[PDB]
Amino acid sequence: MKLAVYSTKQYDKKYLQQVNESFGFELEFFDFLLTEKTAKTANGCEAVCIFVNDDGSRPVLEELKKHGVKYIALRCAGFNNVDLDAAKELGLKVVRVPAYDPEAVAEHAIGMMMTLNRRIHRAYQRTRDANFSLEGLTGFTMYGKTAGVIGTGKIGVAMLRILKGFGMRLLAFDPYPSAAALELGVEYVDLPTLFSESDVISLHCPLTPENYHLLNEAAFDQMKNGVMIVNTSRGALIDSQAAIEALKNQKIGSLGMDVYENERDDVFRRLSACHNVLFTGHQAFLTAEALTSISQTTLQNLSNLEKGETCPNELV
Template sequence: MRILAVGVQADEKPLIEQAFGDHHEVRCLDVFLTEDTAPIAAGYEVLSTGVNDDLGGPVLRTLAAGGTRMIAQRSTGFNNIDLQTAERLGLTIARVSSYSPYAVAEFAWALALAVNRRIVRASTRTRDFDFRLDGLMGRDLHGRTAGVMGTGKIGEAFARIAHGFGMRLLGWDIAENPACTELGMKYVHKDRLLAESDLVTLHVPLMPETQHIIDARALKAMKDDAILVNSSRGGLIDTVALVAELREGRFTGVGLDVYEAEAGLFFLDKSLQAIEDDTLARLVTFPNVLVTSHQAFYTEDAVRQIVDTTVRNVLDYTAGRRSANVLVPRS
């Protein structure tokens, strides 16, 4: 069986080809799926996609008409997929329900430390042989409060690192994680977490209930000198409201690995083009903001796990098996 994988990064390609090599023929393209590019999948029964591919109703109908019967998403998130339309069309949908939580948690900490200790600004200065310390003062995190919103596997990994720093832990989630309470985490209402935390980190999935969970009201509830980190999904933060608060000089630092309008931007080279997204263009101008391009998951360990799980999902499909990774079962 021939498989098409789209949105494939250069580092991913050999891993995907190697993983599928003993099972099925796979073609890897760096093209992202849109209504315009969907026809390239014609003739491929199985399509492997990423979180920034468009899998809305129109695209799914084009895929189904071209012979696609199974979509293997190479991510945990699936908010880009119209599951109801997929079910009506008889498409099987599977995802990667979990992979290394340490990859994302460690990167979230990299963002937090970078904005706290002004690492990017310091690096830029020293490249120009400017070795002044003006404007580079950070704060000890030891003894301060880390607020972890979402205490699943990634949130737990983040909390363990915070505990190692000697931080007080506050948590918010629909259910308490015993491993986090053993670390001394106290679960509180969201408003209290935002008001008391020196560092707020987001590790919740993007759903209708969590869309803009950090809105204008939530941002105003935070300390003026807090650090905000988001390595989960861009839609968790109302970016327009965040820019408004940054314009007022608030927050020690903001580290964002995701952006709510990142589709069509992230994973692509836009360096020679004018960026039409005024909100993103303004966001990256703030000296206390660090934006990266959805790379928290991007370690060799995590990508190998993602690829291996994707292969298993495809093999399960061909064998007629169903696993916990299946979002829409084979009809």
């Protein structure tokens, strides 16, 4: 089969090429966005492979189908940029990667948390230019503090495993407690208790109507002064405006956000400069092993479709 890959970054290319050694697809890599105008560049391909900024609205899907495309493979878990009803009407198959390597994501969240804690991002800015002053870099010992994890799916549990290794007291919130978390000694609590008791908070939950702007003024109001917050889940779990205010106020001691590529809204520049704030550009799954799993699943998804096999990751 022939596959056109849109929004291609060098790391996308590297792992798709590597994995394709087991599949033998003809791969065509485009660095630009799939849009209604660029969809004609998929001519001669049975499949396209897209990511979060690509446009999968109806007019694009119509243009793909006119050019003979049959299959759309999201190299990601999110699918809000694809009109699935239109895809279904047009006869197009849509597949996705059901979830990222949960350990890669959790380990990114701990990496953000420790970089923020010990100001290692600031330290490097100093030491790369041979300034070894430690003023302002003082952090906190994690051992013995309380961590709150919101969401105990596979990612959140991977996070809790790590936090346990740091010797922290483990609190969680989730509507549905997970057995794996309870073996780690995690105490499920309600959100108000999690807010009020947690030295560090990390979000590992899907965005739903119920938890949209879950971290808002009232939430921050209840947190400890100097609380550390990391969000590697969707940006909308947090009310930006309330966060900035709580930063200025000094309720939030540190904030780390892995900012999704279609959620970016110089708030970034100011907050990064003036506060212990760290943005990363949707980097939580960016490891060799996790990018390999994404590629594997993507090309295995397409292989299924081509052979008429059942594809567990089919959205339509």
